[PDB]
Design a protein around this ligand. Structure first.
Ligand SMILES: Cc1noc2c1-c1sc(C)c(C)c1C(c1ccc(Cl)cc1)=N[C@H]2CC(N)=O
Length: 128
């Protein structure tokens, strides 16, 4: 039976990182807002292809991402800038759209969070 890959890295001493104000915002506004939402749960951790019985998941999805991972990265100050974080978010939503057919419960869930994600992003502060 097929196994899961290791999750994405959340700490990496080689990688350059910063704490910006835009990045403070990405956890305090953007992630807080999504994490609490009723449709967040499928995205709070890596997709478990073994227990969900999705042996094709990690054949089709080559760059997995999830909010648990993004959360741990924000907390460990893993990022250099806001765009890196923002990119993880768009990878998460996109992976969901790529794997699942449109109109699926899980797509609707990704769509809702995404909206919230964009409403909180649009008022990203100026780099201070
Ligand atoms: C993220 C993500 N992307 O795809 C999937 C996920 C996850 S994570 C997780 C814990 C579950 C239950 C799923 C669901 C899913 C299916 C229906 C509803 Cl209401 C909510 C999630 N669907 C799988 C795909 C599949 N066909 O099972």
């Amino acid at each position: 039976g097929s196994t899961n890959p290791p999750p994405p890295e959340t700490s990496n001493p080689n990688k350059p990182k910063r704490q910006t104000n835009q990045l403070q915002y990405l956890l305090r506004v953007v992630l807080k807002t999504l994490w609490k939402h009723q449709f967040a749960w499928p995205f709070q951790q890596p997709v478990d292809a073994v227990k969900l019985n999705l042996p094709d998941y990690y054949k089709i999805i080559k760059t997995p991402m999830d909010m648990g991972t993004i959360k741990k990265r924000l907390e460990n100050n893993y990022y250099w800038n806001a765009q890196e974080c923002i990119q993880d978010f768009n990878t998460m939503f996109t992976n969901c759209y790529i794997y699942n057919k449109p109109g699926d419960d899980i797509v609707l869930m990704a769509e809702a969070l995404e909206k919230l994600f964009l409403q909180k992003i649009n008022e990203l502060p100026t780099e201070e």
